[PDB]
C-alpha cells in the first residue's frame, strides 16, 4: 500500500508515507477479496485491533485499539463521529452495515488535536464514497442460513455530475433468529467548476436483531432489537492549487428499539433510544513551504429522547471545536502538528495537541518520535443517570511514541513502541452508587509490521504486543489479548485468486459468570485460519468462495458466548 493518499490525517489529501503516525488503509478490493461480511471482520485483522463480540453478527461488540478502552477509539463515517456511538459513548460496528464500507483509513495514535473527543487509541475512518464508476449486481449464500443480495452503481449524468446508488439486503442466523440488515444509499456529487464542487448524500438502514436476554418471571423478555438509522450529508468543496476548503454538514437520526415481540415494539415495557445528531464543519488547508497549515471549526449537536440511554429525561449536548494543524518538511526532517480546543455545553473547554518529528538518517530508513495529548468526554449515562454525575471531567491521555520505518530488499517494515498514560478515568462505585472520576492506566506496547512480495506470493504480516495495566493496582486491564499475530498470504494462480488469512490471538482474561463471587478466568490462546478463492468466469462474473475458520476452533472472546467454527460462503458478483 505505501505512498498512496489518505484524508484522515488532517482532513485533507496527503500521501500516506508523509503521515508520520502509524497507518493502515483497507480498500473495497481489499475487502472483496477477504469476503468480509461485517465491519468487525475488516477491522479484526488490522494491527493493534483487538475485538470482542457476544457471538455472531449484529451482536453487542467492542473494539480495543492498542489496549485502550472500548470508549477510546473514534470511529468516523466519511469524517464525522459515528452516530451510533452517541448514546453509549462507545463505538460499536456490529450494527453498521458492511455495504457502506469502501475505504478504511486507520491511523493509530492520539488525534484529539484534530478530531476532538475520544480519539485516544486511534481513528477508524470508514469511508462510504469511492471513485470506481460502473455497476455491480452481487449475491452471497452461506451457512447459518446466511443470504445476501446487493446492487450498486455510479454513473455520470453529464461530465460534471456523478450519481452513486446502492441497496443491500443481508440476513443471517447462528438467540434464535440472529441478525437482519437492510440498507439504502444514494449520493450525488457535482462540479460547479474545475475546483468548486458540492454534494448531497443520504443513506439509511434497518436492522432487526435477536439476542439472548436475562430472564425474570412476570416481566417481558426484551430479546429483540429493531434499529432504524439514517444520515444526510451535504457539502461544498473548493479544491484549489494552494488553498483547500471543506464546508460539511450532516444530520443523523437513529431509533433503537428493544422490546418483547409478544408485548410489542410500542408497548410501555419497550426501551427506545432515539438520538439526533447534527454537525457543521469548516476545514481549511493552505500549502506553505514544503508543507501546509490548516485550521477549521467543527461543531456538533446531540439530542436525546426521555428514556434514551437509561436516563429519565432527554438531554442536549452541544460542542464546538476550533483547531489548527501544521505540517512542514525541511531537508531530511519532518515536523507535523495539531492543536484543538473543545468548548462543551456540559464541561466547559479542554485543549489538546500532538507533535511529531521525522528525520530520515539513511535514504529509505527513518526514525519517528512523537508526543500527543488526547481526551474522552463523559457520556450521557454517567452524567445524567441515577449513577451519573454532572460535574465529571473528560478522561485524560498522555501518549508518547518512537518508531523506525524502512524499506529493505522489497520489504517495508516498522518496529515501534508506545507509551499511553490514561488518567482521570470515570468509574462506578458500589459503596456510594455514583460515577466518579478516579481511575488511571499505564499502557505499554510494541508494534511490528512488515509486508513483502516473494515471487507470486504477497505477504502482509504484523505483530502486536500490548500490556495494558491499571496504574494503581499494577493488575492487567482484563479482556485484552496479550499479543496477536496477523498474517495474510495472497497469491493468485492460474487466474484462481488465492488468499490465506491467519490470526493468532493471544490470551484474554475474562470473568466467569457461573459462580458467585464472579471469579476471573484465563482464556486460551488460539490460531485461526481462513481460506478464500475467487475465479473470474467472464470479464463480469467473478465467483468467489470462502471457508471461514477452517479447523473448526472453539474460541470465545466474551467468556460464555460461543462463536461459529466451520462455516462456508459461496458468492458471485457481476461487473459491467
Amino acid at each position: 500500500s505505501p505512498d498512496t493518499l489518505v484524508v484522515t490525517a488532517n482532513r485533507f489529501e496527503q500521501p500516506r508515507s508523509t503521515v508520520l503516525a502509524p497507518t493502515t488503509v483497507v480498500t473495497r478490493q481489499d475487502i472483496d477479496r477477504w469476503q468480509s461480511t461485517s465491519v468487525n471482520d475488516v477491522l479484526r485483522r488490522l494491527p493493534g485491533v483487538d475485538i470482542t463480540q457476544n457471538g455472531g453478527s449484529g451482536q453487542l461488540s467492542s473494539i480495543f485499539i492498542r489496549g485502550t478502552n472500548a470508549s477510546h477509539v473514534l470511529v468516523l463515517i466519511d469524517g464525522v463521529r459515528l452516530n451510533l456511538a452517541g448514546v453509549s459513548g462507545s463505538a460499536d460496528l456490529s450494527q453498521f452495515p458492511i455495504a457502506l464500507v469502501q475505504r478504511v483509513e486507520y491511523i493509530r495514535g492520539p488525534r484529539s488535536a484534530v478530531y476532538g473527543s475520544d480519539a485516544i487509541g486511534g481513528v477508524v475512518n470508514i469511508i462510504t464514497t469511492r471513485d470506481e464508476p460502473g455497476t455491480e449486481i452481487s449475491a452471497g449464500w452461506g451457512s447459518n442460513s446466511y443470504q445476501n443480495y446487493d446492487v450498486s452503481t455510479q454513473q455520470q449524468l453529464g461530465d460534471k455530475t456523478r450519481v452513486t446508488l446502492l441497496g443491500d439486503y443481508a440476513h443471517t442466523h447462528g438467540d434464535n433468529d440472529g441478525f437482519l440488515s437492510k440498507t439504502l444509499y444514494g449520493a450525488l456529487e457535482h462540479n460547479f467548476t474545475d475546483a468548486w464542487s458540492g454534494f448531497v448524500r443520504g443513506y439509511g438502514y434497518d436492522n432487526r436483531t435477536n439476542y439472548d436476554a436475562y430472564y425474570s418471571p412476570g416481566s417481558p423478555l426484551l430479546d429483540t432489537r429493531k434499529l432504524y438509522s439514517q444520515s444526510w450529508d451535504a457539502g461544498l468543496r473548493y479544491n484549489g492549487e494552494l488553498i483547500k476548503s471543506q464546508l460539511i454538514t450532516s444530520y443523523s437520526h437513529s431509533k433503537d428499539y428493544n422490546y418483547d415481540p409478544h408485548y410489542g415494539r410500542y408497548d410501555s415495557s419497550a426501551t427506545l433510544d432515539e438520538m439526533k445528531q447534527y454537525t457543521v464543519q469548516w476545514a481549511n488547508n493552505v500549502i506553505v513551504g514544503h508543507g501546509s497549515i490548516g485550521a477549521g471549526v467543527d461543531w456538533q449537536k446531540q439530542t436525546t429522547t426521555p428514556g434514551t440511554g437509561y436516563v429519565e429525561d432527554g438531554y442536549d449536548q452541544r460542542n464546538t471545536g476550533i483547531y489548527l494543524t501544521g505540517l512542514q518538511q525541511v531537508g531530511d526532517f519532518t515536523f507535523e502538528g495539531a492543536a484543538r480546543s473543545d468548548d462543551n455545553s456540559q464541561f466547559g473547554r479542554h485543549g489538546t495537541w500532538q507533535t511529531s518529528a521525522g528525520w530520515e538518517f539513511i535514504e529509505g530508513y527513518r526514525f519517528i518520535a512523537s508526543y500527543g495529548t488526547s481526551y474522552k468526554a463523559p457520556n450521557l449515562g454517567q452524567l445524567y443517570g441515577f449513577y451519573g454525575n454532572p460535574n465529571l471531567d473528560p478522561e485524560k491521555s498522555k501518549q508518547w511514541e518512537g518508531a523506525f520505518e524502512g524499506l529493505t530488499a522489497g520489504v517495508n517494515w516498522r518496529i515501534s513502541g508506545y507509551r499511553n498514560d490514561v488518567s482521570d478515568l470515570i468509574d462506578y462505585d458500589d459503596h456510594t452508587l455514583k460515577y466518579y472520576n478516579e481511575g488511571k492506566a499505564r499502557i505499554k506496547g510494541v508494534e511490528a509490521t512488515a509486508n513483502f512480495d516473494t515471487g507470486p506470493l504477497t505477504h502482509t504480516v504484523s505483530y502486536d504486543y500490548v500490556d495494558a495495566r491499571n496504574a494503581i493496582t499494577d493488575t492487567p486491564l482484563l479482556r485484552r489479548a496479550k499479543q496477536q499475530v496477523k498474517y495474510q498470504l495472497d497469491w493468485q494462480l492460474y487466474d484462481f485468486d488465492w488468499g490465506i488469512t491467519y490470526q493468532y490471538l493471544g490470551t484474554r482474561y475474562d470473568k466467569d459468570y457461573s459462580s458467585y463471587p464472579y471469579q476471573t478466568v484465563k482464556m486460551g490462546g488460539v490460531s485461526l485460519w481462513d481460506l478464500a478463492v475467487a475465479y473470474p468466469v467472464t470479464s463480469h462474473l467473478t465467483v468467489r468462495g470462502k471457508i471461514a475458520n477452517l479447523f473448526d476452533k472453539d474460541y470465545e472472546t466474551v467468556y460464555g458466548y460461543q462463536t461459529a467454527g466451520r462455516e462456508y460462503t459461496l458468492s458471485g458478483s457481476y461487473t459491467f
Partner: protein
C-alpha cells in the same frame, strides 16, 4: 344595655372558630393523602435501589447481560427519585398547612374564650 354588642363579638367568634374547624379538617384530609402517597412512592424507590444493589455486580462489565438489568434498574430508581421529590415537596407544603391551621384554630379558640367571658358580664 350591651344586649347586642356582646352577641355581635361572640356570634362572630363562633363563626371564627367554625370556618377554622373546616380549615383544620380539610388540612388533615390533605395531609393524610400526602403522607400515604409519599410512603407509597418512598418504597417504590426503596425497591428500585434494593434492585440496584442486587445487580450492581454486573455494573463494571457492559457485555455481561446482567449489566442491562443494572442499567434499567437505575432508571427505575431515577423515575422514582423524581416521584419521591415531588410528593415530598407536596407533603411538606401540606405539613405547613396542618401546623398553621392547628395553631390558627387554637388561636381562634382562646380568642373566643375571651369574648365568651365578655358575655357573662355584659349580659
Amino acid at each position: 344595655r350591651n344586649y347586642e354588642r356582646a352577641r355581635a363579638e361572640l356570634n362572630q367568634a363562633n363563626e371564627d372558630v367554625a370556618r377554622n374547624q373546616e380549615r383544620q379538617a380539610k388540612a388533615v384530609q390533605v395531609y393524610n393523602s400526602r403522607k400515604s402517597e409519599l410512603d407509597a412512592a418512598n418504597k417504590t424507590l426503596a425497591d428500585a435501589i434494593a434492585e440496584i444493589k442486587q445487580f450492581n455486580r454486573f455494573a463494571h462489565d457492559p457485555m455481561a447481560g446482567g449489566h442491562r438489568m443494572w442499567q434499567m434498574a437505575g432508571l427505575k430508581a431515577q423515575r422514582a427519585q423524581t416521584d419521591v421529590n415531588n410528593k415530598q415537596a407536596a407533603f411538606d407544603a401540606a405539613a405547613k398547612e396542618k401546623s398553621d391551621a392547628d395553631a390558627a384554630l387554637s388561636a381562634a379558640q382562646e380568642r373566643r374564650k375571651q369574648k365568651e367571658n365578655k358575655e357573662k358580664d355584659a349580659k
